[PDB]
């Protein structure tokens, strides 16, 4: 699996199930096929949207660039509402830059328009770790309080990952 081979298994009580969602990339940011599919969906949605904008006169106002930015915003908003990105708001989801401040007239004369997009694709759950303690009879609440305080503080100030990885 770390080498990019996705296995198919015959699990009792489940049937035939794919137990892998990794790509062949060595890039840690596109490890999962879900991220690749999300990026492809964004790109193809935008391309199909802009197909109607191709071969449109660039009038004096250059309002077509602002219209393109508007269309990009609405398209990506619906992708956020579908749920492809991570966060709690569109501001944490995606950002767009397609105004005339990024368009060079020399390229416009040739018919070139540049648009810049940033997105935060959603992630997945691959392996789930259960770290469970066995307490004595009576000290459950005290042990929970202490351990929970420690864990929450470490995560809050970023020292949770600070530590060796077992085996």
């Amino acid at each position: 699996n770390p080498e990019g081979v996705n296995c198919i298994l015959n699990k009792e009580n489940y049937g035939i199930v794919v137990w892998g969602a990794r790509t062949l990339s060595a890039d840690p940011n596109i490890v999962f096929i879900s991220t690749r599919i999300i990026l492809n969906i964004v790109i193809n949605t935008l391309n199909r949207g802009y197909d109607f904008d191709i071969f449109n006169s660039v009038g004096g106002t250059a309002t077509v660039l602002d219209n393109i930015q508007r269309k990009t915003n609405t398209l990506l908003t619906t992708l956020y509402q579908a749920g492809l990105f991570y966060g709690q708001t569109t501001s944490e989801a995606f950002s767009v830059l397609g105004d005339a401040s990024v368009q060079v007239p020399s390229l416009l004369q040739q018919g070139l328009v540049n648009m810049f997009i940033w997105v935060v694709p959603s992630t997945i759950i691959e392996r789930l770790i259960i770290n469970i303690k066995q307490t004595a009879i009576g000290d459950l609440e005290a042990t929970v309080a202490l351990d929970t305080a420690a864990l929450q503080s470490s995560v809050e100030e970023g020292t949770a990952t600070e530590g060796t990885a077992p085996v």
């Binding site: 770390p2 392996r127 789930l128 770290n131 469970i132 303690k133 503080s153 470490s154 060796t164």
Partner: protein, 84 residues
């Protein structure tokens, strides 16, 4: 420390480990620290204040030292709070 257990695992799935003692670091604010001026034969950090995480770390870095008892008492009384 209780978060990296699943890092060196390739197969997907649910796995179980034991909940160990997780260290809770201190926030940096005045008078959360104690500076012990002592001597160790191995001059690893000669005249250089070095943070110590516990008595085991103190022994590993400095080995023998007459301040080992003081270090142990400090850690026992501080219970993970404060820095040495």
């Amino acid at each position: 420390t209780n978060f990296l257990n699943g890092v060196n695992i390739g197969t997907p799935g649910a796995y179980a480990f034991y909940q160990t003692t997780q260290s809770r670091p201190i926030n940096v604010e005045p008078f959360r620290t104690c500076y012990m001026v002592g001597f160790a034969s191995n001059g690893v950090n000669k005249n250089v204040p070095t943070r110590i995480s516990n008595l085991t770390d103190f022994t590993n870095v400095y080995g023998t030292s007459a301040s080992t008892n003081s270090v142990d008492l400090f850690f026992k009384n501080s219970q993970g709070f404060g820095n040495l």
